Design an enzyme around this catalytic site. Sequence first.
Site, PDB file in Angstrom:
ATOM      1  N   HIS B  41      -3.394-112.258  84.268  1.00 42.77           N
ATOM      2  CA  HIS B  41      -4.077-111.460  83.239  1.00 42.77           C
ATOM      3  C   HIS B  41      -3.325-111.451  81.884  1.00 42.77           C
ATOM      4  O   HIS B  41      -3.813-110.839  80.932  1.00 42.77           O
ATOM      5  CB  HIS B  41      -4.438-110.041  83.703  1.00 42.77           C
ATOM      6  N   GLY B 143       3.572-102.632  80.142  1.00 39.77           N
ATOM      7  CA  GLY B 143       4.554-103.682  79.910  1.00 39.77           C
ATOM      8  C   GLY B 143       5.369-104.064  81.132  1.00 39.77           C
ATOM      9  O   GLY B 143       6.090-105.067  81.110  1.00 39.77           O
ATOM     10  N   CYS B 145       4.171-105.154  83.920  1.00 38.52           N
ATOM     11  CA  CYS B 145       3.491-106.246  84.617  1.00 38.52           C
ATOM     12  C   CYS B 145       4.363-107.469  84.759  1.00 38.52           C
ATOM     13  O   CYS B 145       5.041-107.845  83.806  1.00 38.52           O
ATOM     14  CB  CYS B 145       2.180-106.576  83.927  1.00 38.52           C
TER      15      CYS B 145
END
Lengths: 297, 300
Positions: B41, B143, B145
């Site tokens: 993503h 952030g 991720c």
Amino acid sequence: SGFRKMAFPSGKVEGCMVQVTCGTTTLNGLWLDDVVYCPRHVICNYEDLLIRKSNHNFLVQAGNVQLRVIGHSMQNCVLKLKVDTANPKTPKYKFVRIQPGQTFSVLACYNGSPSGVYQCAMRPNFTIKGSFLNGSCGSVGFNIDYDCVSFCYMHHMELPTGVHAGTDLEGNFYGPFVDRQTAQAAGTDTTITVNVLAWLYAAVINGDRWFLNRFTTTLNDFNLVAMKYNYEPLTQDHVDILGPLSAQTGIAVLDMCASLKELLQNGMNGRTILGSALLEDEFTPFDVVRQCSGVTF
Amino acid sequence: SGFRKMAFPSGKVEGCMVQVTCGTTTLNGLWLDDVVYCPRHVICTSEDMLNPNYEDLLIRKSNHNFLVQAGNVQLRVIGHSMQNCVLKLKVDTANPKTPKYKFVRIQPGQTFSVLACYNGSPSGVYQCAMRPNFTIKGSFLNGSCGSVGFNIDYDCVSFCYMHHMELPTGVHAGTDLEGNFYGPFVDRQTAQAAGTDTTITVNVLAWLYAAVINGDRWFLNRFTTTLNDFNLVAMKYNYEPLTQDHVDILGPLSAQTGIAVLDMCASLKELLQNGMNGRTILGSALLEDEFTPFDVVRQC
Ligand SMILES: O=C(Nc1cncc2ccccc12)[C@@H]1CCOc2cc(F)c(Cl)cc21
């Protein structure tokens, strides 16, 4: 979202862990520049025992590489072994002495090999409630400030109650303890009040508000109740330190104290705060801000 | 003595954390050899989140669209491929700090350490378990991720998790390092709800054995139970069924403490009925389920 007991990343400290062997004893050492720091009980009148040891009696192992000891000196309860090689992995570091209530990460080692990392507080009775087995002596406690490792603890022993005792990196013990096999008891522990309040702010930030109330209290009235429930006195310094969290959540520190006061006199009533049925006291106000803001190292 | 929730030393994983930037999105990547792994993503925009076609969005990207930063050094992306929900960015430099590693898919109840990162910089390490509902109860902000879960056994790093999303209840969902999600989750902003969580029974029993090893015996009783009778009671407290595999796994702890698994099962049954009565077990007023039988033996 989410609140976890989080330790500082241990990488900068793993690069400093070595194995120190003297006679039959094998423990961990901290290799910084050309000096290896370790508990002086590795030689086990410490001046007398140390004078009888030579540089080749200390076997220092940094991974699969043996370091040659070219000197030995003692600073309080820490032995300093001068080595021929400077640790290339030496980070930016400082030796600091922490106060009770302050938290730090512990890199548990066995035979100079890091096996675990955990977060913990220096209890008001100067013990740490660690998790240590035989061979963990010399395991260090640390904090990270930007790119600087502040070494604040070196593990020396386990008290008969399962709690741990150690020193700062200058060999000065935390607490009324001696590095000797003798009857030693940890004093009755108290709860780190400012840390509980910081954890209550962290719960509010995470959406847990059931414990909040309309009430506020005087600092003197709160301290009367804190003394009664074995909680550490809350000073004006603590109130000031909780300021940013108070501004962020819109709950005055003395307003959060009335919630804590009620939690102590009434309990949780089957409810939990951040998945805990007890009031957590091992998160400092700075730890809460760091976790609920995302500061990196 | 002492029992703590202990994470693995994160050093071997810190040397692999990089920052991956694609357009406006910035998350973390795992740099192993000449490949940077990150959530796919990272290629998503505003209107490509509810129903993104990742094959379509990735075909429109070029190697120079991905900005990879390893410390203060920018890495050159020389290829990009997608394996399920993970994006694999081939780079022109092999990570010299690449440890001995493996990609491992774990089962619910399994524990692992999390190195939480923001902008390719590790900020903290904590321990957690894969919940029976396939979510993790992490501590993550925007952030985070691409932050990874791992176990470090015998010098080797087993990567088992990559953080992808936060569900509306504050719990976290992610994938193994081959991009396969844990649970019925998808990397889309569609309505996704975690199933009702349950307690990892085998881990609670392992933690009760850890308490016995540490001298806590107050919760023990003269009772034993059948495995079926335990499961009938445990299911009513939202506890996971205890299988014969779990009973077998608890064998070494049962031999060490001299307390049969089904006897410890009866202690657990009683604790569920009475609560703790103001008492604690290993400094906890709740039953802890994030220590596997393997963790208990490891720590004790
Ligand atoms: O959730 C997301 N990452 C975060 C991770 N962990 C913790 C968080 C805490 C706060 C805010 C974001 C958090 C992102 C951005 C927001 O929406 C989505 C939607 C998605 F379908 C996917 Cl795959 C990712 C995200």
